[PDB]
Curated annotation (Swiss-Prot), chain A:
Protein name, as recorded: Platelet-activating factor acetylhydrolase IB subunit beta
Domain notes: Dimerization mediated by the LisH domain may be required to activate dynein.
Location of this chain's protein in the cell: Cytoplasm, Cytoskeleton; Cytoplasm, Cytoskeleton, Microtubule organizing center, Centrosome; Cytoplasm, Cytoskeleton, Spindle; Nucleus membrane
Phenotype when changing D226H: In LIS1; reduces neuronal migration in vitro
Keyword terms: Acetylation, Cell cycle, Cell division, Coiled coil, Cytoplasm, Cytoskeleton, Developmental protein, Differentiation, Disease variant, Lipid degradation, Lipid metabolism, Lissencephaly, Membrane, Microtubule, Mitosis, Neurogenesis, Nucleus, Phosphoprotein, Repeat, Transport, WD repeat
Gene designation: PAFAH1B1
Chain segments carrying region Interaction with NDEL1: 297-319
Natural source organism: Homo sapiens
More about this protein: Originally the subunits of the type I platelet-activating factor (PAF) acetylhydrolase was named alpha (PAFAH1B1), beta (PAFAH1B2) and gamma (PAFAH1B3). Now these subunits have been renamed beta (PAFAH1B1), alpha2 (PAFAH1B2) and alpha1 (PAFAH1B3) respectively.
WD repeats: 15-56, 57-96, 99-138, 141-180, 183-242, 245-286, 287-319
A molecular-function term among this protein's GO annotations: dynein complex binding
Tissue spec: Fairly ubiquitous expression in both the frontal and occipital areas of the brain.
Entry annotated with the keyword Manganese: no
Swiss-Prot record, chain E:
Name of the gene this protein is made from: DYNC1H1
Function description: Cytoplasmic dynein 1 acts as a motor for the intracellular retrograde motility of vesicles and organelles along microtubules. Dynein has ATPase activity; the force-producing power stroke is thought to occur on release of ADP. Plays a role in mitotic spindle assembly and metaphase plate congression.
Shown residues within the full chain: 1937 to 2033 of 4646
Domain of life (superkingdom): Eukaryota
Disulfide bond sites: none
The protein's name: Cytoplasmic dynein 1 heavy chain 1
Family to which this protein belongs: Belongs to the dynein heavy chain family.
Location within or outside the cell: Cytoplasm, Cytoskeleton
Disease per UniProt entry: Charcot-Marie-Tooth disease, axonal, type 2O: An axonal form of Charcot-Marie-Tooth disease, a disorder of the peripheral nervous system, characterized by progressive weakness and atrophy, initially of the peroneal muscles and later of the distal muscles of the arms. Charcot-Marie-Tooth disease is classified in two main groups on the basis of electrophysiologic properties and histopathology: primary peripheral demyelinating neuropathies (designated CMT1 when they are dominantly inherited) and primary peripheral axonal neuropathies (CMT2).
Self-association state and partner proteins as the record states: Homodimer. The cytoplasmic dynein 1 complex consists of two catalytic heavy chains (HCs) and a number of non-catalytic subunits presented by intermediate chains (ICs), light intermediate chains (LICs) and light chains (LCs); the composition seems to vary in respect to the IC, LIC and LC composition. The heavy chain homodimer serves as a scaffold for the probable homodimeric assembly of the respective non-catalytic subunits. The ICs and LICs bind directly to the HC dimer and dynein LCs assemble on the IC dimer. Interacts with DYNC1LI1; DYNC1LI1 and DYNC1LI2 bind mutually exclusive to DYNC1H1.
Domain remark from Swiss-Prot or TrEMBL: Dynein heavy chains probably consist of an N-terminal stem (which binds cargo and interacts with other dynein components), and the head or motor domain. The motor contains six tandemly-linked AAA domains in the head, which form a ring. A stalk-like structure (formed by two of the coiled coil domains) protrudes between AAA 4 and AAA 5 and terminates in a microtubule-binding site. A seventh domain may also contribute to this ring; it is not clear whether the N-terminus or the C-terminus forms this extra domain.
Protein species of origin: Homo sapiens
Length: 319, 290, 291, 330, 97, 322, 48, 49
């Protein structure tokens, strides 16, 4: 679908007293959740832009938050060296999870809905159990601060980006770096994978040849401070195209729900919508007076949410 | 007001004025004819919400304790005995009564319990309304020019009052002497210089008002005639009870002779159009009234 | 009742008159005067002093004869069976039908309504009169003598206060529609507040304000409105006299307006209370802002 | 003031000058009803109308449903004799004030001039007064306008002359009622109902005599049938005085004869002492109407056959009242 | 009242009998106006029954009385007898007259 | 697809889930191909059942919304919530144009008269109130029920309104004169839902129950009353007799209604099932495991072959019919 | 089960006559109105 | 209006609805059925014995 943000805004929510770090969309409910650096997690109704409640269980600045497939549990990571699990029915912290030394950067829940991953400055990725809270296995091999980590769509493959210029893809069963990618000019910050709605669109947009199985293979995308966005092939490990034009460091990247366009945010105070199919759409949209931190795309609703350093969260219509 | 007001306005213009003033206070409109009037009354009393009740000619005697302020103070709360139940009377509660019949009679007890506020049509107000109406129809450029300037003068005069108030505000809050802190001098220079152009803006606006006024002097006799005709209309009830005419009836006659006048099809001279309008105004009024 | 009251000479005389009747058996009041003159408030104040329980019917738009009868049944049961001192205060605006006066006419004179209690309610009333008579120690069994005790109790206990405006034609009409109202009721003509009463209210209420002018010059021709105004009046006394004159100006205004044929609204003492209250607030506000 | 003597143009005023929110109050003096005009107005506009007679509890219920249905469907609602329920009228006005009806919605309240009508209702709606036409010329114009053109212009060419003669007779008889002791013996109820019955009587007997022929002889017209029926059933029914019946008989025989078709026939004799009213020589509806519009403005009781001094006291009294009305409203 | 007059009319319409209502002005003024609506509906049905195009083989002519369809017999008629000289008697509305 | 015989099938078409609280009721738009559902989160979400795409949320109620309804034209939506308020919505603009107060407790039903100029509602204060669409004034109150009145529904012509209450009785009222036409009491427990018989079903009902044809020609209005005793009973309003009793639900019946063609009865209960009934033979053909929790309500489209059922699991489902 | 819960509101002034009236109330509802009533009472409510 | 009630040895079995806090929500927020009157509880109310 041709959902595209427009320069006019709808609501500019400003309730945080500290810069916002990430924003997400609730899988089912009309709820938008924003995480900031004041150790508070705020809940908003993006349809009407009304502050709902806050979750102030964390100690230090909250870095990354994530939901599950059912939207029942909320996982949070912060600089207080802990992972907090939130029950979204009553909005209370039901399990505080320790270990994973020093500032924890990112956290995510695999679509299995049973295990949680996390990334921190301690140059490792830890996999946990939501039910119990014991770290069964730990991922090692990154030599620097691991910034941002995402799983796949079926809880088997995990990619992690770090300051060490390497984006390593890990496997649940074998716990080995199947593909190691060390080619970025400057620090990689944000990564995101490709939904099934876009696998077909990649084949003729890049000229890639199908393998014997015919399936194009898992796809990767990494955003780095070098002002370049590069999308990668997990199965092979080579580039297909590099997106250039961001004025400053990029902080968030993800695919359109229709899998046709590219939406990203960067430290250039603007949001850029880019087309990789034909390089036709290069819409640059001024989003905030200060650095833009993170963004998200609603799966079905024509709404996009952006978080910035200016203590303000904005929602744009999609047309 | 001390006693709760009762509003008499046949045209109803006072009704939305009460609404607009108390719109921020979530004022609620009800009527005595509504069977659920009691529930709205208790909700307003308990939560202190402004209430406007229409059709006072069907006045419910249940308001007698409310209008008389027969309150009971005990335990720190204010208690009012509405019917047979006690309700905590919030101090922010206020009630307004309105009606559209200027000739409705009231029992003396009701007259004592309320403060009558009569919204009658005056000769000066009617002349201004008709003069503005003909100006819009005949000289729309002048009418919009006058409308913009009135807005300009209002916020010019408001600005001067704020500047004058702030200048006294700054001079009364200096902890010591004026020259001790340079920022004080900056404020006074800004405040004094701010009124410099506003005074000139007022002056340049005033001279255009002189031109606007001097072109509306031609339509003054028509507005004066309109006031005489309408007050003749109202006084027609002295000779027969059937000759009841409202202000809206005269406005429709005035509107018809201005926009729906067949004699203004090809006439472009302002003096000729004004004469035609004046001649047809008397003819149209007589045709409709008789 | 948390409402301020200004006391003058007429109030003291009036409350004494009300207190006199309330201490008498089968004492009924007929208070006549302009609305808002304090007839209800004075009766309620006196009723509390003598232990009477004030009862007023909560009339509304849908009020009907059956509703009036039900209220009468409740009052009589409390007055007769429960031996409770009740001051039944009713305003003439509560009379929405001629049947309201018909019930009152029998109740005022006889002390009981023959047709009020029938069927199950009569049995319930008869039962309630049984243990009712037990508490005073009277052993009465049959229905007939029980009713006599109930009738006697109502006469001793129930007191009725009827207040209405001084309408000349209405007074003559009510003289025939309710003969018991003019025979079983003591008529007190409160009327409108006199010139002295208006002066006393103004003098007391405006005492808080300064109203002092040492260099005030007394004019040769003083527009004397209050007859007992001191011959060398002070600035405060002149102000209060002006306040009285303002109220009397409206009375002449309505008379001239009514004579010509216009619609007039009656001027009540509550208008005077608003006048002085506005005077007190405006004087305080203007003095504060000027300083 | 030339507009007022013309018949009221309900089609133009209702369609344009009346807002849907404003009810059309149509007041009438006793002996006149405005219901018939609206039904004719609705028929020629091809607009459905619901007529409800006020006076019953269920009548109020139908009025509420008809008004509620019409304001959304754009239909028309008639409520006749609303003056009989002044209390309900006040409730009706309050409902009308808070209403946003269809653009084609129209409400007609047919009532007589009664002091009990609520004041607010009169101010809310537009008032129309129905009363006897001021003069004979006005009475002709109302009569000709009410009767459809196609009704007059039938196969016999003498029908137009008969209708004109009936219109003159109706105009003379009705106009005489302003002089209660002289024109008649009492205020008879000579209204449109009598005129319609007379028109139907003329059509029935003319068709019975003339079997579709284009022209008929003036003497072959059933003059006796028209003279007797008008003097006994149509107009003579309301007459209870022998001398009034004699007066009505005199007018009928003076008008409904074969001599009425003559070119020199006289409607009235010596109206001003020298001039007299003359029979128009036209044979069509238009020619008769043109002659009516050409009648002199001045009118005297001699037009009715009454002495010229019969209106001296009446005119003097009306003049004094006009002065008093002016002096009461200065 | 309105109901009784309508019920009587229903009996007269179905039977086809002449109804003579002497002292017709003794009814209330408001209720005389209400009756006029029923008479007009009855008279309209009679007029539409008399046209030549009507055939007895078609549906019978009916009028709306008391929210019901009632057959109207051509032989039925309505007659009212009154004495207007008595003071206090109601005045028949113009639409009824 | 027989144009008066389609019945729902186990394979669901759409599973709409956006509500944060149990779905109270689901209704169809009479004109547009759009769906409206009310839940307990004080929200009234609007869905399109052809594409299963959420469109917008109608908020404004303070507490849980209990009932929603549409007028004949579909231009007005009447919603009642548990906050003692009734709100009228301009459907084209999707804004609350009028809020109605006067009920003394929870309001559990609301409906717009077929004429579209009046609104009927029932609440927990044991009263059934009537309101004016134009003015929002309460004009009538129907008293007589001894307990909380759960549902109120009018007949086709709007002259009669039926009500079911916690007093285990079903009362039929006359709008014109407020009188209680009949007091239908045969359920042994609280009655939850009521439904009238459409004009296309009177002949079928008459021939199925064996009732002889009446000389008047009208068999009389027929009413259905699902109650919590797991039984569905069809009544004759004219005679006050229970024509039949349907048995087979395993729990409290929450909704009941006729097929648009007047050939079957659709009823949903708390047994997690939606059941289609044959009143011709007094037995059930097909049982659908609609939801994983209680089924709160159901609705049947007048023309299109679609069935919607709300549920406590915060899921609204659309059923194709074949 | 649809049973209407009835509990006697006892107090210091509660005597035998009050209990008899309550028994009359529940029997009238459960015997004349065909109303199913689950009469719940505690041993503390048995004063006499 | 916080309340202190002395002489608990003569406890009135009318505070049982108050002590058990068997109030219900909706239709006026907290609703307590004190005897036969549907009293509306005040959240600031508290009793000491
Ligand atoms: N002596 C008084 N001093 C001050 N206010 C008074 C006095 N008497 C009456 N009022 C005012 O009159 C109001 C009550 O009037 P009320 O006695 O009900 O009128 P009525 O005598 O017609 O029944 C009170 O609100 C009170 O403010």
């Amino acid at each position: 679908k041709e959902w595209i943000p427009r320069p006019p805004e709808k609501y500019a929510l400003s309730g945080h007293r500290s810069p916002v770090t990430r924003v997400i969309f609730h899988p089912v409910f009309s709820v938008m959740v924003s995480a900031s650096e004041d150790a508070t997690i705020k809940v908003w109704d993006y349809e009407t832009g009304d502050f709902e409640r806050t979750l102030k269980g964390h100690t230090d600045s909250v870095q990354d938050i994530s939901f599950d497939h059912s939207g029942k549990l909320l996982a949070s990571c912060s600089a207080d060296m802990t992972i907090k699990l939130w029950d979204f029915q009553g909005f209370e912290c039901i399990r505080t999870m320790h270990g994973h030394d020093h500032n924890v950067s990112s956290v995510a829940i695999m679509p299995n809905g049973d295990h949680i991953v996390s990334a921190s400055r301690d140059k490792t990725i830890k996999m946990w159990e939501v039910q119990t809270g014991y770290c069964v296995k730990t991922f090692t091999g990154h030599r620097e601060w691991v910034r941002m980590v995402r799983p796949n769509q079926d809880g088997t493959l995990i990619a992690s980006c770090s300051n060490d210029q390497t984006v390593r893809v890990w496997v649940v069963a074998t716990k080995e770096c199947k593909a190691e990618l060390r080619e970025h000019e400057h620090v990689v910050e944000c990564i995101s994978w490709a939904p099934e709605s876009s696998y077909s669109s990649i084949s003729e947009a890049t000229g890639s040849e199908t393998k014997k199985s015919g399936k194009p293979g898992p796809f990767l995308l990494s955003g780095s401070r070098d002002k370049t966005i590069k999308m990668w092939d997990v199965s092979t490990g080579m580039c297909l195209m590099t997106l250039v034009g961001h004025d400053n460091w990029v902080r968030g990247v993800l695919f359109h729900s229709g899998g046709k366009f590219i939406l990203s945010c960067a430290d250039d105070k603007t949001l850029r919508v880019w087309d990789y199919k034909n390089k036709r759409c290069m819409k640059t949209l001024n989003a905030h007076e200060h650095f833009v931190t993170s963004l998200d795309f609603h799966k079905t609703a024509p709404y996009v949410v952006t978080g910035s350093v200016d203590q303000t969260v904005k929602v744009w219509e999609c047309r | 007001f001390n006693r709760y007001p009762l509003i008499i306005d046949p045209s109803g213009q006072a009704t939305e004025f009460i609404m607009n003033e108390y719109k921020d206070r979530k004022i609620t409109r009800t009527s005595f004819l509504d069977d659920a009037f009691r529930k709205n009354l208790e909700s307003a009393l308990r939560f202190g919400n402004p209430l406007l009740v229409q059709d006072v000619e069907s006045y419910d005697p249940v308001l007698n304790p409310v209008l008389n302020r027969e309150v009971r103070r005990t335990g720190g709360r204010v208690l009012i005995t509405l019917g047979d139940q006690d309700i905590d009377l919030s101090p922010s509660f206020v009630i307004f009564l309105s009606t559209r019949d200027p000739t409705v009679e009231f029992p003396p007890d009701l007259c004592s319990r309320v403060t009558f506020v009569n919204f009658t049509v005056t000769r000066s107000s009617l002349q201004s309304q008709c003069l503005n109406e003909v100006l819009k129809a005949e000289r729309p450029d002048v009418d919009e020019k006058r409308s913009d300037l009135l807005k300009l003068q209002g916020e010019f005069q408001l600005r001067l009052r704020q500047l004058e108030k702030s200048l006294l505000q700054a001079l009364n809050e200096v902890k010591g002497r004026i020259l001790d802190d340079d920022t004080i001098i900056t404020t006074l220079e800004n405040l004094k210089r701010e009124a410099a152009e506003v005074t000139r803006k007022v002056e340049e606006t005033d001279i255009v008002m002189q031109e606007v006024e001097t072109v509306s002097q031609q339509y003054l006799p028509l507005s004066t005639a309109c006031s005489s005709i309408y007050f003749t209309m109202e006084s027609l009830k002295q000779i027969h009870f059937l000759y009841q005419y409202s202000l809206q009836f005269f406005l429709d006659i005035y509107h018809n002779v201005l926009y729906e006048n067949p004699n203004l099809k090809g006439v472009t001279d302002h003096t000729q159009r004004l004469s035609i309008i004046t001649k047809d105004l008397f003819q149209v009024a007589f045709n409709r009234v008789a | 009742l948390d409402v301020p009251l200004v006391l003058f000479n007429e109030v003291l005389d009036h409350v004494l008159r009300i207190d006199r009747i309330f201490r008498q058996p089968q004492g009924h009041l007929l208070l006549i005067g302009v609305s808002g003159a304090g007839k209800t408030t004075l009766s309620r104040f006196v009723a509390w002093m003598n232990g009477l329980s004030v009862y007023q019917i909560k009339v509304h738009r849908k009020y009907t004869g059956e509703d009036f009868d039900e209220d009468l049944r409740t009052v009589l049961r409390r007055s007769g069976c429960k031996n409770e001192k009740i001051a039944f205060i009713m305003d003439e605006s509560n009379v929405l039908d001629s049947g309201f006066l018909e019930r009152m006419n029998t109740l005022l004179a006889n002390g009981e309504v023959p047709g009020l209690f029938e069927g199950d309610e009569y049995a319930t009333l008869m039962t309630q009169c049984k243990e009712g008579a037990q508490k005073e120690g009277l052993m009465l069994d049959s229905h007939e003598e029980l009713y006599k005790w109930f009738t006697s109790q109502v006469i001793r206990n129930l007191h009725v206060v009827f207040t209405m405006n001084p309408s000349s034609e209405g007074l003559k009409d009510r003289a025939a529609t309710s003969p018991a109202l003019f025979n079983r009721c003591v008529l007190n003509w409160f009327g409108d507040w006199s010139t002295e009463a208006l002066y006393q209210v103004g003098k007391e209420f405006t005492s808080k304000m300064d109203l002092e002018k040492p260099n005030y010059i007394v004019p040769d021709y003083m527009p004397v409105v209050y007859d007992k105004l001191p011959q060398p009046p002070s600035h405060r006394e002149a102000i209060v006299n002006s306040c009285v004159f303002v109220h009397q100006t409206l009375h002449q205004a309505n008379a001239r307006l009514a004579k010509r044929g216009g619609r007039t609204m009656a001027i009540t003492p509550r208008h005077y209370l608003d006048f002085i209250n506005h005077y007190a607030n405006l004087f305080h506000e203007k003095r504060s802002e000027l300083e | 003031m030339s507009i007022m003597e013309q018949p009221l143009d309900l089609t133009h005023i209702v369609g344009t000058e009346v807002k849907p929110n404003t009810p059309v109050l149509m007041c009438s003096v006793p002996g006149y009803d405005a219901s018939g005009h609206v039904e004719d107005l609705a028929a020629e506009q091809n607009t459905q109308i619901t007529s409800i007679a006020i006076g019953s509890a269920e009548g109020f219920n139908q009025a509420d449903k008809a008004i509620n249905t019409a304001v959304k469907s754009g239909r028309w609602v008639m409520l006749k004799n609303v003056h009989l329920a002044p209390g309900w009228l006040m409730q009706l006005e309050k409902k009308l004030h808070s209403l946003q009806p269809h653009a084609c919605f129209r409400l007609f309240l047919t009532m007589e001039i009664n002091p009990k009508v609520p004041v607010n209702l009169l101010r809310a709606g537009r008032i129309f007064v129905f009363e006897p036409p001021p003069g004979v010329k006005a009475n002709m114009l109302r009569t000709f306008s009410s009767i459809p053109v196609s009704r007059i212009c039938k196969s016999p060419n003498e029908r137009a002359r008969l209708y004109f003669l009936l219109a003159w007779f109706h105009a003379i008889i009705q106009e005489r009622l302003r002089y209660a002791p002289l024109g008649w013996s009492k205020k008879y109820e000579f209204g449109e109902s009598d005129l319609r019955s007379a028109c139907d009587t003329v059509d029935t007997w003319l068709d019975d005599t003339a079997k579709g022929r284009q022209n008929i002889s003036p003497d072959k017209i059933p003059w006796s049938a028209l003279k007797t029926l008008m003097a006994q059933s149509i107009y003579g029914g309301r007459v209870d005085n022998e001398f009034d019946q004699r007066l009505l008989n005199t007018f009928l025989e003076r008008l409904f004869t074969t001599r009425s078709f003559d070119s020199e026939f006289k409607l009235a004799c010596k109206v001003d002492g020298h001039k007299d009213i003359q029979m128009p020589d036209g044979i069509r509806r238009e020619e008769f109407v043109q002659w009516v519009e050409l009648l002199p403005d001045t009118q005297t009781p001699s037009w009715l056959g009454l002495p010229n001094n019969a209106e001296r006291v009446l005119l003097t009294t009306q003049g004094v009242d006009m002065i008093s009305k002016m002096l009461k409203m200065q | 009242d309105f109901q009784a007059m309508g019920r009587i009319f229903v009996g007269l319409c179905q039977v086809g009998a002449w109804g003579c209502f002497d002292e017709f002005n003794r009814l209330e003024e408001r209720m005389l106006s209400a009756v006029s609506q029923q008479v007009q509906c009855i008279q309209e049905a009679l007029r539409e029954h008399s046209n030549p195009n009507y055939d007895k083989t078609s549906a019978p002519i009916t009028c709306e009385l008391l929210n019901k369809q009632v057959k109207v017999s051509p032989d039925m008629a309505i007659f009212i007898t009154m004495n207007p000289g008595y003071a206090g008697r109601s005045n028949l509305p113009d639409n009824l007259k």
